[PDB]
Amino acid sequence: CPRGVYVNFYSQTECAENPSYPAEVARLNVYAFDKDGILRSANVFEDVQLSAAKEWLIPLEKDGLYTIFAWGNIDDHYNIGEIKIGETTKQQVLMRLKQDGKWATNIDGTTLWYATSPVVELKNMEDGADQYIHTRANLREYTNRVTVSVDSLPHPENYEIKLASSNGSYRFDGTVAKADSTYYPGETKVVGDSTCRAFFTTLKLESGHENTLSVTHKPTGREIFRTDLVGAILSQNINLRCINDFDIRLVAHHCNCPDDTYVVVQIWINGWLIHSY
């Protein structure tokens, strides 16, 4: 007698009043872990079109409590670790962003999604126990698009914006695995006479590890600015658990000190003045 959980995938961010069903999610990796956090089921679905009334069957066999972990748009940008049924556990590393040294592969134009379903339960069918069961899971986007401008700066082509974060590795549950920091590829436009703009696509932005935004004078290598992006943020208005796009302005000014060097004296994020210096 065959058994399983039907799962419906939605996206409702917490600031959203109605659930969404993002077209951005094109494929799925859905795992089932049991009472012990051991992998019991591993499934892959291509051609995903999330919908209000669409479901996906997650095969199970033995009665019990299960939680489902779901990943959207797992790509060949990622090094996938061991996945072994009856062995692999919830907190092992599923995934590492592919890197070249400490530089991330460029993931602009990609979305990455995670959901945890509630705990569900296959009950003894020999007694009063349904069919298959059903549940829903909320896909939260883990990718973040971060635009940064450094303003009022002579020779803006001589400066480089960098974004480091220890956020390229994830456990089976959606949590960030500990790792060395990862630099993300900052594609650049000198936009103004005194302005330089960089665009980063990074993964999850949360406290608990390095999330360093920095500005460096390339010819000398002199880092003129460094701050923890998440820290700056959580100093809102700017709620990381509902948002995924970050327009950041860094206002530079000559230091007036005997270093004849520039410094950052204002950091704006999504239109809020976060810190003056």
mmCIF file of C-alpha atoms in Angstrom:
data_model
loop_
_atom_site.group_PDB
_atom_site.id
_atom_site.type_symbol
_atom_site.label_atom_id
_atom_site.label_comp_id
_atom_site.label_asym_id
_atom_site.label_seq_id
_atom_site.Cartn_x
_atom_site.Cartn_y
_atom_site.Cartn_z
ATOM 1 C CA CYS A 1 0.000 0.000 0.000
ATOM 2 C CA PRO A 2 1.608 3.283 -1.246
ATOM 3 C CA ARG A 3 1.821 6.442 0.908
ATOM 4 C CA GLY A 4 2.972 10.068 0.807
ATOM 5 C CA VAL A 5 2.395 13.761 1.460
ATOM 6 C CA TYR A 6 0.928 16.117 -1.102
ATOM 7 C CA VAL A 7 2.628 19.500 -0.779
ATOM 8 C CA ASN A 8 1.443 22.862 -2.039
ATOM 9 C CA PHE A 9 4.001 25.589 -2.537
ATOM 10 C CA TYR A 10 3.295 29.260 -1.966
ATOM 11 C CA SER A 11 5.234 32.394 -1.043
ATOM 12 C CA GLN A 12 3.990 34.770 1.611
ATOM 13 C CA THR A 13 6.687 36.903 2.997
ATOM 14 C CA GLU A 14 5.213 38.006 6.413
ATOM 15 C CA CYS A 15 4.593 41.572 5.266
ATOM 16 C CA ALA A 16 2.393 40.132 2.515
ATOM 17 C CA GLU A 17 -1.353 40.029 3.165
ATOM 18 C CA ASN A 18 -2.013 37.401 0.455
ATOM 19 C CA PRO A 19 0.101 34.354 -0.530
ATOM 20 C CA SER A 20 2.017 34.523 -3.808
ATOM 21 C CA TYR A 21 3.054 31.768 -6.219
ATOM 22 C CA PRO A 22 6.260 33.065 -7.836
ATOM 23 C CA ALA A 23 6.909 32.102 -11.444
ATOM 24 C CA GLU A 24 10.594 32.467 -10.503
ATOM 25 C CA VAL A 25 10.536 28.967 -9.037
ATOM 26 C CA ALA A 26 11.253 26.622 -11.963
ATOM 27 C CA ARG A 27 12.393 23.452 -10.243
ATOM 28 C CA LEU A 28 12.280 21.765 -6.839
ATOM 29 C CA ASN A 29 14.321 19.517 -4.582
ATOM 30 C CA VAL A 30 12.023 18.261 -1.823
ATOM 31 C CA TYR A 31 13.305 16.127 1.052
ATOM 32 C CA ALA A 32 11.532 14.303 3.868
ATOM 33 C CA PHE A 33 13.123 13.809 7.272
ATOM 34 C CA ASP A 34 11.576 11.734 10.047
ATOM 35 C CA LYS A 35 11.286 11.848 13.842
ATOM 36 C CA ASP A 36 15.092 11.469 14.057
ATOM 37 C CA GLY A 37 16.052 14.013 11.412
ATOM 38 C CA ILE A 38 17.161 11.241 9.060
ATOM 39 C CA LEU A 39 16.537 11.494 5.297
ATOM 40 C CA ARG A 40 13.651 9.245 4.240
ATOM 41 C CA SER A 41 12.703 10.661 0.850
ATOM 42 C CA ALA A 42 14.498 12.682 -1.859
ATOM 43 C CA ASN A 43 12.620 14.123 -4.819
ATOM 44 C CA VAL A 44 13.350 16.327 -7.816
ATOM 45 C CA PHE A 45 10.745 18.151 -9.917
ATOM 46 C CA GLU A 46 11.514 19.962 -13.150
ATOM 47 C CA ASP A 47 9.120 22.292 -15.020
ATOM 48 C CA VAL A 48 7.663 23.668 -11.801
ATOM 49 C CA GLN A 49 4.909 26.234 -12.080
ATOM 50 C CA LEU A 50 3.764 27.072 -8.569
ATOM 51 C CA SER A 51 0.026 27.517 -8.284
ATOM 52 C CA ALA A 52 -2.711 27.998 -5.686
ATOM 53 C CA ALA A 53 -4.156 24.578 -6.388
ATOM 54 C CA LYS A 54 -1.103 22.639 -7.546
ATOM 55 C CA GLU A 55 0.365 19.837 -5.440
ATOM 56 C CA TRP A 56 3.424 17.591 -5.540
ATOM 57 C CA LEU A 57 3.475 14.081 -4.065
ATOM 58 C CA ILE A 58 6.337 13.310 -1.693
ATOM 59 C CA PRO A 59 6.644 9.514 -1.384
ATOM 60 C CA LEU A 60 6.890 8.085 2.137
ATOM 61 C CA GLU A 61 6.448 4.547 3.471
ATOM 62 C CA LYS A 62 6.605 3.990 7.197
ATOM 63 C CA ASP A 63 3.987 5.759 9.354
ATOM 64 C CA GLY A 64 5.207 8.615 11.551
ATOM 65 C CA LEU A 65 6.139 12.281 11.925
ATOM 66 C CA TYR A 66 7.882 13.978 9.051
ATOM 67 C CA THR A 67 9.075 17.415 8.109
ATOM 68 C CA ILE A 68 9.640 18.436 4.526
ATOM 69 C CA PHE A 69 12.468 20.719 3.381
ATOM 70 C CA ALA A 70 12.095 22.315 -0.029
ATOM 71 C CA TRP A 71 14.592 24.007 -2.294
ATOM 72 C CA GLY A 72 13.750 26.058 -5.336
ATOM 73 C CA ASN A 73 16.072 26.505 -8.288
ATOM 74 C CA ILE A 74 18.981 24.395 -7.137
ATOM 75 C CA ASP A 75 21.377 24.960 -10.005
ATOM 76 C CA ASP A 76 24.796 23.928 -11.289
ATOM 77 C CA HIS A 77 26.072 27.083 -9.524
ATOM 78 C CA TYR A 78 26.120 24.793 -6.477
ATOM 79 C CA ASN A 79 28.290 21.922 -5.266
ATOM 80 C CA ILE A 80 25.815 19.366 -3.916
ATOM 81 C CA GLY A 81 26.956 17.132 -1.048
ATOM 82 C CA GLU A 82 25.996 13.616 0.093
ATOM 83 C CA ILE A 83 22.313 12.709 -0.169
ATOM 84 C CA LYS A 84 21.776 9.229 1.263
ATOM 85 C CA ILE A 85 18.403 7.867 2.349
ATOM 86 C CA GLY A 86 18.392 6.268 5.769
ATOM 87 C CA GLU A 87 21.739 7.948 6.528
ATOM 88 C CA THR A 88 21.889 11.663 5.666
ATOM 89 C CA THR A 89 20.577 13.951 8.450
ATOM 90 C CA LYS A 90 18.755 17.319 8.622
ATOM 91 C CA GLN A 91 21.789 19.355 9.674
ATOM 92 C CA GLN A 92 24.391 18.087 7.201
ATOM 93 C CA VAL A 93 25.496 20.422 4.443
ATOM 94 C CA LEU A 94 23.348 20.078 1.364
ATOM 95 C CA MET A 95 24.940 22.780 -0.686
ATOM 96 C CA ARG A 96 27.911 25.062 -1.254
ATOM 97 C CA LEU A 97 27.960 27.985 -3.672
ATOM 98 C CA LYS A 98 30.553 27.182 -6.316
ATOM 99 C CA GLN A 99 33.650 29.266 -5.868
ATOM 100 C CA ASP A 100 36.961 30.137 -7.432
ATOM 101 C CA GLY A 101 39.189 30.797 -4.470
ATOM 102 C CA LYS A 102 37.046 32.998 -2.254
ATOM 103 C CA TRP A 103 35.139 34.358 -5.229
ATOM 104 C CA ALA A 104 31.594 33.140 -5.773
ATOM 105 C CA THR A 105 30.400 32.040 -9.213
ATOM 106 C CA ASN A 106 28.301 34.840 -10.652
ATOM 107 C CA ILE A 107 24.693 34.184 -9.712
ATOM 108 C CA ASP A 108 23.042 37.368 -11.014
ATOM 109 C CA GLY A 109 19.661 36.647 -12.522
ATOM 110 C CA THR A 110 19.016 33.578 -10.375
ATOM 111 C CA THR A 111 16.585 33.077 -7.511
ATOM 112 C CA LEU A 112 17.083 30.582 -4.730
ATOM 113 C CA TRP A 113 14.231 29.517 -2.511
ATOM 114 C CA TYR A 114 13.649 27.624 0.723
ATOM 115 C CA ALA A 115 10.608 26.302 2.573
ATOM 116 C CA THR A 116 9.981 24.314 5.724
ATOM 117 C CA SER A 117 6.600 22.634 5.908
ATOM 118 C CA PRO A 118 4.920 22.049 9.227
ATOM 119 C CA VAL A 119 5.360 18.681 10.870
ATOM 120 C CA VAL A 120 2.973 16.254 9.208
ATOM 121 C CA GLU A 121 1.972 12.741 10.156
ATOM 122 C CA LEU A 122 1.325 9.472 8.320
ATOM 123 C CA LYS A 123 -1.090 7.626 10.585
ATOM 124 C CA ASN A 124 -1.724 3.871 10.783
ATOM 125 C CA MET A 125 -3.855 3.159 7.739
ATOM 126 C CA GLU A 126 -4.945 -0.081 9.391
ATOM 127 C CA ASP A 127 -6.857 2.240 11.711
ATOM 128 C CA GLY A 128 -8.558 5.529 10.924
ATOM 129 C CA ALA A 129 -5.841 6.996 8.705
ATOM 130 C CA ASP A 130 -6.123 8.817 5.434
ATOM 131 C CA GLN A 131 -5.074 8.019 2.050
ATOM 132 C CA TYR A 132 -2.185 10.328 1.588
ATOM 133 C CA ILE A 133 -1.949 13.501 3.666
ATOM 134 C CA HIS A 134 -1.627 17.123 2.589
ATOM 135 C CA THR A 135 0.308 20.192 3.648
ATOM 136 C CA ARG A 136 1.534 23.607 2.452
ATOM 137 C CA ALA A 137 5.033 25.118 2.496
ATOM 138 C CA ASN A 138 6.122 28.785 2.335
ATOM 139 C CA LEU A 139 9.000 29.453 -0.038
ATOM 140 C CA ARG A 140 11.161 32.334 1.118
ATOM 141 C CA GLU A 141 13.695 33.809 -1.292
ATOM 142 C CA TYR A 142 17.293 33.524 -0.081
ATOM 143 C CA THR A 143 18.971 35.419 -2.931
ATOM 144 C CA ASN A 144 19.389 39.164 -2.429
ATOM 145 C CA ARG A 145 20.092 41.764 -5.046
ATOM 146 C CA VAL A 146 22.253 44.511 -3.632
ATOM 147 C CA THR A 147 23.081 47.720 -5.475
ATOM 148 C CA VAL A 148 25.743 49.987 -4.022
ATOM 149 C CA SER A 149 26.831 53.457 -5.093
ATOM 150 C CA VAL A 150 29.801 55.391 -3.786
ATOM 151 C CA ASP A 151 29.172 59.062 -4.339
ATOM 152 C CA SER A 152 31.173 62.281 -4.599
ATOM 153 C CA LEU A 153 34.530 60.665 -5.226
ATOM 154 C CA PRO A 154 37.332 61.806 -7.502
ATOM 155 C CA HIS A 155 38.370 59.117 -9.975
ATOM 156 C CA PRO A 156 35.528 56.693 -9.123
ATOM 157 C CA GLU A 157 37.120 54.126 -11.427
ATOM 158 C CA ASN A 158 39.998 53.830 -8.908
ATOM 159 C CA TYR A 159 37.681 52.406 -6.246
ATOM 160 C CA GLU A 160 36.244 48.932 -5.803
ATOM 161 C CA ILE A 161 33.145 47.824 -3.963
ATOM 162 C CA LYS A 162 33.253 44.399 -2.383
ATOM 163 C CA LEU A 163 30.704 42.261 -0.605
ATOM 164 C CA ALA A 164 31.906 39.393 1.563
ATOM 165 C CA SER A 165 29.637 36.980 3.377
ATOM 166 C CA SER A 166 29.847 33.552 4.980
ATOM 167 C CA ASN A 167 26.548 32.641 3.344
ATOM 168 C CA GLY A 168 27.388 30.168 0.542
ATOM 169 C CA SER A 169 26.672 26.957 2.401
ATOM 170 C CA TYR A 170 23.337 25.617 3.569
ATOM 171 C CA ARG A 171 22.177 22.659 5.638
ATOM 172 C CA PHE A 172 19.236 20.535 4.503
ATOM 173 C CA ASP A 173 16.955 22.574 6.740
ATOM 174 C CA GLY A 174 17.228 26.090 5.416
ATOM 175 C CA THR A 175 19.986 27.202 7.795
ATOM 176 C CA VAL A 176 23.363 28.720 6.950
ATOM 177 C CA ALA A 177 26.202 26.283 7.365
ATOM 178 C CA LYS A 178 29.343 27.776 8.844
ATOM 179 C CA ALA A 179 32.018 28.545 6.244
ATOM 180 C CA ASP A 180 34.772 30.966 5.208
ATOM 181 C CA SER A 181 33.524 34.230 3.804
ATOM 182 C CA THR A 182 32.699 34.464 0.135
ATOM 183 C CA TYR A 183 33.295 37.422 -2.101
ATOM 184 C CA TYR A 184 30.511 38.161 -4.588
ATOM 185 C CA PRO A 185 31.222 39.361 -8.174
ATOM 186 C CA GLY A 186 30.591 43.092 -8.248
ATOM 187 C CA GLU A 187 29.854 44.133 -11.800
ATOM 188 C CA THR A 188 30.434 47.871 -12.064
ATOM 189 C CA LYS A 189 29.474 51.113 -13.818
ATOM 190 C CA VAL A 190 31.179 54.423 -13.267
ATOM 191 C CA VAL A 191 27.889 56.257 -13.422
ATOM 192 C CA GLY A 192 28.704 59.838 -12.451
ATOM 193 C CA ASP A 193 31.805 62.006 -12.660
ATOM 194 C CA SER A 194 32.156 61.232 -8.974
ATOM 195 C CA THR A 195 29.953 58.157 -8.703
ATOM 196 C CA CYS A 196 30.545 54.405 -8.988
ATOM 197 C CA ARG A 197 27.766 51.790 -8.943
ATOM 198 C CA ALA A 198 28.115 48.048 -8.289
ATOM 199 C CA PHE A 199 25.537 45.231 -8.455
ATOM 200 C CA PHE A 200 25.813 42.044 -6.382
ATOM 201 C CA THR A 201 23.669 38.972 -6.197
ATOM 202 C CA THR A 202 24.357 37.264 -2.923
ATOM 203 C CA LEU A 203 22.572 34.588 -0.959
ATOM 204 C CA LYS A 204 21.054 34.870 2.521
ATOM 205 C CA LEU A 205 21.539 38.025 4.561
ATOM 206 C CA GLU A 206 21.305 37.347 8.234
ATOM 207 C CA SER A 207 23.157 38.048 11.427
ATOM 208 C CA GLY A 208 25.483 35.490 12.949
ATOM 209 C CA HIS A 209 28.481 35.629 10.631
ATOM 210 C CA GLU A 210 30.413 38.008 8.417
ATOM 211 C CA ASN A 211 28.467 40.274 6.096
ATOM 212 C CA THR A 212 31.092 42.818 5.145
ATOM 213 C CA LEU A 213 30.440 45.632 2.693
ATOM 214 C CA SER A 214 33.687 47.402 1.832
ATOM 215 C CA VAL A 215 35.275 50.073 -0.375
ATOM 216 C CA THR A 216 38.884 49.886 -1.496
ATOM 217 C CA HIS A 217 41.245 52.175 -3.407
ATOM 218 C CA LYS A 218 42.397 49.743 -6.128
ATOM 219 C CA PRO A 219 45.728 51.304 -7.173
ATOM 220 C CA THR A 220 47.014 51.228 -3.574
ATOM 221 C CA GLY A 221 44.823 48.534 -2.107
ATOM 222 C CA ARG A 222 43.948 50.973 0.664
ATOM 223 C CA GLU A 223 40.598 49.931 2.077
ATOM 224 C CA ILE A 224 38.960 53.270 2.905
ATOM 225 C CA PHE A 225 35.696 51.753 4.175
ATOM 226 C CA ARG A 226 34.369 48.615 5.895
ATOM 227 C CA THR A 227 31.071 47.836 7.676
ATOM 228 C CA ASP A 228 28.848 44.894 8.523
ATOM 229 C CA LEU A 229 25.879 45.288 6.178
ATOM 230 C CA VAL A 230 23.481 43.304 8.321
ATOM 231 C CA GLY A 231 24.550 45.131 11.481
ATOM 232 C CA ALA A 232 24.156 48.501 9.769
ATOM 233 C CA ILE A 233 20.711 47.397 8.652
ATOM 234 C CA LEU A 234 19.514 46.156 12.017
ATOM 235 C CA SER A 235 20.382 49.533 13.570
ATOM 236 C CA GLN A 236 13.131 49.121 10.602
ATOM 237 C CA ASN A 237 11.656 49.824 7.878
ATOM 238 C CA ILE A 238 14.435 47.568 6.649
ATOM 239 C CA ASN A 239 13.194 44.105 7.458
ATOM 240 C CA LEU A 240 15.462 41.398 6.009
ATOM 241 C CA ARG A 241 12.747 38.786 6.444
ATOM 242 C CA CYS A 242 10.422 40.509 3.960
ATOM 243 C CA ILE A 243 12.781 42.179 1.511
ATOM 244 C CA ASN A 244 15.415 41.044 -1.041
ATOM 245 C CA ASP A 245 16.584 44.176 -2.853
ATOM 246 C CA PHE A 246 18.946 46.687 -1.347
ATOM 247 C CA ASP A 247 19.811 50.098 -2.778
ATOM 248 C CA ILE A 248 22.801 51.351 -0.809
ATOM 249 C CA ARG A 249 24.426 54.744 -1.008
ATOM 250 C CA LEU A 250 27.845 55.530 0.407
ATOM 251 C CA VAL A 251 28.638 59.221 0.623
ATOM 252 C CA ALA A 252 32.382 59.794 0.384
ATOM 253 C CA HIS A 253 34.186 62.923 1.464
ATOM 254 C CA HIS A 254 37.801 63.968 1.617
ATOM 255 C CA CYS A 255 39.055 63.214 5.124
ATOM 256 C CA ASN A 256 40.401 66.740 5.817
ATOM 257 C CA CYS A 257 43.056 64.936 7.928
ATOM 258 C CA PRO A 258 46.738 64.734 6.903
ATOM 259 C CA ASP A 259 46.125 61.533 4.930
ATOM 260 C CA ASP A 260 44.848 63.267 1.789
ATOM 261 C CA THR A 261 42.446 60.293 1.633
ATOM 262 C CA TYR A 262 38.699 59.799 1.282
ATOM 263 C CA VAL A 263 36.351 58.329 3.820
ATOM 264 C CA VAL A 264 32.682 57.392 3.987
ATOM 265 C CA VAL A 265 30.557 59.823 6.023
ATOM 266 C CA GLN A 266 27.010 58.583 5.302
ATOM 267 C CA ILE A 267 25.508 55.231 4.509
ATOM 268 C CA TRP A 268 21.989 55.211 3.054
ATOM 269 C CA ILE A 269 19.976 51.988 2.711
ATOM 270 C CA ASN A 270 16.661 51.912 0.842
ATOM 271 C CA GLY A 271 16.282 55.646 1.310
ATOM 272 C CA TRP A 272 16.997 55.704 5.034
ATOM 273 C CA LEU A 273 20.030 57.393 6.533
ATOM 274 C CA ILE A 274 21.510 54.530 8.530
ATOM 275 C CA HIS A 275 24.722 56.094 9.863
ATOM 276 C CA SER A 276 26.632 59.323 9.632
ATOM 277 C CA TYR A 277 30.308 59.373 10.604
#
